[PDB]
Design an enzyme around this catalytic site. Structure first.
Site, PDB file in Angstrom:
ATOM      1  CB  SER A  74      -1.096  -0.125   1.176  1.00 50.15           C
ATOM      2  OG  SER A  74      -1.819   0.839   1.144  1.00 50.15           O
TER       3      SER A  74
ATOM      4  CG  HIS B 167      -5.557  -2.849   0.823  1.00 47.37           C
ATOM      5  ND1 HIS B 167      -4.890  -2.870  -0.409  1.00 47.37           N
ATOM      6  CD2 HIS B 167      -5.133  -2.375   1.860  1.00 47.37           C
ATOM      7  CE1 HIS B 167      -3.802  -2.004  -0.163  1.00 47.37           C
ATOM      8  NE2 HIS B 167      -3.875  -1.776   1.178  1.00 47.37           N
TER       9      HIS B 167
ATOM     10  CD  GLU C 119      -5.694  -4.314  -3.787  1.00 48.31           C
ATOM     11  OE1 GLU C 119      -5.851  -3.608  -2.670  1.00 48.31           O
ATOM     12  OE2 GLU C 119      -4.505  -5.039  -3.769  1.00 48.31           O
TER      13      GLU C 119
END
Ligand SMILES: *[C@@H]1O[C@H](CO[C@@H]2O[C@@H](C)[C@@H](O)[C@@H](O)[C@@H]2O)[C@@H](O[C@@H]2O[C@H](CO)[C@@H](O)[C@H](O)[C@H]2NC(C)=O)[C@H](O)[C@H]1NC(C)=O
Ligand SMILES: *[C@@H]1O[C@H](CO[C@@H]2O[C@@H](C)[C@@H](O)[C@@H](O)[C@@H]2O)[C@@H](O[C@@H]2O[C@H](CO)[C@@H](O)[C@H](O)[C@H]2NC(C)=O)[C@H](O)[C@H]1NC(C)=O
Ligand SMILES: *[C@@H]1O[C@H](CO[C@@H]2O[C@@H](C)[C@@H](O)[C@@H](O)[C@@H]2O)[C@@H](O[C@@H]2O[C@H](CO)[C@@H](O)[C@H](O)[C@H]2NC(C)=O)[C@H](O)[C@H]1NC(C)=O
Ligand SMILES: *[C@@H]1O[C@H](CO)[C@@H](O)[C@H](O)[C@H]1NC(C)=O
Lengths: 532, 528
Positions: free
Chosen positions: B200, B439, B326
């Site tokens: 990320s 995620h 995601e």
């Protein structure tokens, strides 16, 4: 010594018709009935004047002249081109209509089908073999009417606001014919209270414009729109662009030697008709595969607003319409100028040819809009596959010009009170002279609707004759009842379920979505972007 | 004393700790200071190298977590708490950690350097899911991780000022990388074989070091997981950064001269800046990133997109990938109708509302284009389809398509790229089923967390974790994860592999149709 069946009196005087033979039996035909004074000389560009009464008997025994028009020469001697070209001499004296009726005349008032031909408002004629009304009338015992209307500059050149060339006179030609039907069709056994208009391509757009014009709307009850809609991007033009085109044509032929309109039209009137036709192609703003020089103008009169606006704001309770498209609407147009295309090859185009084809098939949108089209239609796992590019280009041109305008009209009409029926015609005729990659091209359902496979001189297969009789039955059921159904049922089209049926040799299959994903791009997004 | 646990680095002597794994022991040196504490007058300024010390620094425990917001949305829920600080907050937080095999290697060993995620506003190297002990034992690498300043402390910028130049959290990471070059050999690490990996905002950080030449000489390979420096949330322009810095100054009672303003900000307790950090955002958003890297011509001489399109990437190998879903994780942080405790079956009005909040600063025109692309016009109002569609919107815009654009540009410009999508839902997952593989939940498998006996992963999941550790370490050692082969990602073929318990499956296209919308059309439209 006469045949009483072939003698009819209309409001203007007496007519004598001809008795045609069909595989199913005799029908009466009254071919070439004058419904307007000839629009020649000082009458060119003017609204049609009703035909003055005559003494004696007018022989309505053969198709009259074709209105002056450009004649296609792309594949000379090719059946696929020639079937749409004039089969009568060209003449400005061309405002005649045709009536087919059962033999003997109906005893009871009989529903009426009125055909309006297509041909991009620059061509067409009611005399083409594929529009022969004898099979429909014999098989289904209707009355069929078709009319000639002025095309090209003679029907749609507009100097908006002027007296001498107000525009849309070709549509007024159609309206006059419709008025003639109301006043006279009962003399042939037709029912003026059951009149169904049907047309294809520009004829379908004409049908739709009569729906949206109150003075026309009182002259019929039902409508069929085949592969065309009045909200099509090629079917209307604004007042200013119409004026620019009329002025450009006038300039090209030496008139005047812009200015006062009265004077400019007077110069245009001295030019031979063929001279105007040979210059009509030089008038258009952009290179296009589609666009036609003179089309209906939105000037607040025949159409008080754009068709799209009139459709969106319309109350359509009490109306039944039947609409549809062929399976491969875009293919026919691409061989008429798109880079890489030919009926004589596979037209497996490159990516760059695909990009150039979008511009021609979707004329007059911004680059930004053309980019949106490319993004939408590109498979980004196979961005350069020639076969996929060819297919995508066909869908671009067909979606933008035919399918999505039809779908939009169908959805708005259904949501606003009308009962809609929708089809996709998916049979490729065994007689088809076009290549295989073109699929089922634009215009090739017409021969089945008119029952042409029943012609003994043709070579359609037996199952195609059965198929033709099934579609004639659907069309005639709709004309009589507003419902093509009598067996697999044909459900109405609604804005939510969006159900339509496939027309081919198999029984009816119900499907949903008239290119729903694609048409959301054309009908919902791109219109947002344009105003931005 | 154990000699394996005493190390001298350039600044002085350290004492580490022997850790246990189910595969045997590992040497750990936790809480090594690599910079002077960025406190008082040093807040907002670039980090300074740690001055030498006498005696032995005790490196047996993780150090403090840099000051950050603490997520309180599901208090006590394992899904949220595993990302929250597990140490006391402090501005005295610039420490790094080294894990090495036991006994320490006596041949140069490849080095992995982890940069954690957390929207540049949160995160810590001490989180349980970043425990390096299993990677190091299983694959015989050296593993390094650093704390870097987040939020205002790391990314408040008054561009052009000496006092608050911006991007100091990125400079924290670079100093740690410089520290690795100077000291990693003392632990048995090879400074000429350093692979950066991050997830990320950590992946965005890796990308930014790839595009900043002063950082490029400090490592050799890069792994980007669920992040890219060209992500819409990853950078900010100079004018907007100045506006945000000015508004937080107003919110904490400080005057709008840059010297004056920063001096007042320095007097505020750290907690106070954190308490107001969310209120600087202009519009309401699912993403709370107030202070992020700034494009000021210094660390980034241009936007990451411009730097990516112009770069010569021959000689670089990179590993990039995404999780299967995601977007789902971000939807419960404020998208209307969403919760972990229901099925989040949303209306169309809620779908439209959620688009504006998941795609934060786009025109109505652009938003409309989004809802056109992501609507099934045969089922425009199906709540289950709408929920999944908005998850796709949020995941495509923020993670998948930025990563796909980066991967395609790097491959076309000389880099060897390997791409994955992580498709295994952990048997221990505490989030609901409709979220799929959310995620951040590939990290625990790549750090070998399923090998911990005190956790409840299946036997199959541990084999899987060992597979992923081997891919990652193979890539660190050779630039190639292979030993069913994993082919490189290319702009044309666009091949990637699925990571799950099944053997590798090769597929084409990282949401190719969706990403053409974000990466090719929308940019054109915004300029017009
Ligand atoms: C635009 O011009 C027309 C035509 O001009 C006339 O044509 C000549 C042959 C001759 O008739 C002359 O009178 C003109 O040159 C105008 O129409 C005429 O207008 C005048 C009165 O102003 C008169 O001739 C008649 O009313 C009209 N004759 C016609 C119809 O041929 C028209 O008024 C002009 N309009 C404007 C002001 O632009
Ligand atoms: C496929 O054919 C088209 C059209 O070619 C036509 O048909 C041929 C059999 C021959 O009669 C040509 O003279 C006809 O033009 C090709 O498009 C044209 O290609 C020629 C090549 O010299 C070019 O000069 C023209 O400008 C092209 N016309 C266009 C683009 O409308 C096309 O290239 C062929 N594609 C292939 C390779 O199959
Ligand atoms: C599904 O759940 C969402 C969110 O509800 C949350 O979780 C519940 C268990 C409870 O703790 C609520 O207070 C939480 O908000 C629902 O969305 C909410 O719906 C309520 C009305 O019931 C509304 O007042 C809130 O504003 C909504 N919150 C959001 C973020 O939209 C949703 O209605 C539920 N849908 C179902 C169960 O079909
Ligand atoms: C139909 O086929 C026959 C076969 O002999 C041919 O002679 C005739 O010309 C054809 N007529 C058509 C195609 O209309």
């Amino acid at each position: 010594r006469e045949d009483a069946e072939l003698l009819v009196t209309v409001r203007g005087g007496r007519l004598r018709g001809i008795r045609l033979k069909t595989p199913g039996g005799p029908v009466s035909a009254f071919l070439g009935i004058p419904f307007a004074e000839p629009p020649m000389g000082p009458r060119r560009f003017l609204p049609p004047e009703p035909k003055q009464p005559w003494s004696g008997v007018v022989d309505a025994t053969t198709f009259q002249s074709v209105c002056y028009q450009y004649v296609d020469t792309l594949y000379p001697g090719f059946e696929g081109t020639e079937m749409w070209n004039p089969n009568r001499e060209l003449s400005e004296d061309c405002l005649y209509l045709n009536v087919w009726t059962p033999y003997p005349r109906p005893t009871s008032p009989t529903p009426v089908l009125v055909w309006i031909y297509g041909g991009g408002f620059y061509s067409g004629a009611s005399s083409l073999d594929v529009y022969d009304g004898r099979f429909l009338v014999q098989a289904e015992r209707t009355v069929l009417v078709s009319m000639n209307y002025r095309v090209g500059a003679f029907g749609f050149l507009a100097l908006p606001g002027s007296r001498e060339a107000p525009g849309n006179v070709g549509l007024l030609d159609q309206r006059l014919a419709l008025q003639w039907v109301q006043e006279n069709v009962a003399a042939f056994g037709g029912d003026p209270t059951s009149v169904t208009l049907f047309g294809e391509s520009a004829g379908a757009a004409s049908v739709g414009m009569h729906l949206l014009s109150p003075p026309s709307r009182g002259l019929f009850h039902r409508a069929v729109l085949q592969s065309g809609a009045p909200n099509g991007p090629w079917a209307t033009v604004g007042m200013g662009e119409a004026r620019r085109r009329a002025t450009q044509l006038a300039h090209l032929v030496g008139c005047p030697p812009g200015g006062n309109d009265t004077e400019l039209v007077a110069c245009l009137r001295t030019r031979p008709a063929q001279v105007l036709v040979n210059h009509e192609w030089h008038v258009l703003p952009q290179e296009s595969v589609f666009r036609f020089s003179f089309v209906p103008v939105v000037d607040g009169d025949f159409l008080s607003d754009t068709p799209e606006a009139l459709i969106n704001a319309g109350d359509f309770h009490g109306l039944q319409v039947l609409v549809g498209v062929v399976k491969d609407e875009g293919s026919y147009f691409l061989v008429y100028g798109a880079p890489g295309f030919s009926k004589d090859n596979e037209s497996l185009i490159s990516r760059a040819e695909f990009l150039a084809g979008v511009r021609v098939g979707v004329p007059q949108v911004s680059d930004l809009a053309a980019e949106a089209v490319v993004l939408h239609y590109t498979d980004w796992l196979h961005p350069e596959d020639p076969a996929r590019l060819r297919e995508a280009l066909s869908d671009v041109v067909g979606d933008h010009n035919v399918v999505c305008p039809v779908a939009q009209l169908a959805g708005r009409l259904a949501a606003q009170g009308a009962r809609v029926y929708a089809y996709v015609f998916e049979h490729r005729a065994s007689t088809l002279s076009w290549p295989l990659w073109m699929g089922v091209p634009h215009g090739y359902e017409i021969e089945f609707i008119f029952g042409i496979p029943l012609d003994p001189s043709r070579n359609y297969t037996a199952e195609e004759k059965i198929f033709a009789q099934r579609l004639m039955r659907y069309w005639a059921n709709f004309a009589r009842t507003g419902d093509p159904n009598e067996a697999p049922q044909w459900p109405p089209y609604t804005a939510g379920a969006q159900q339509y049926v496939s027309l081919d040799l198999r029984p009816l299959e119900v499907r949903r979505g008239l290119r729903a994903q694609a048409c959301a791009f054309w009908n919902r997004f791109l219109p947002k972007l344009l105003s931005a």
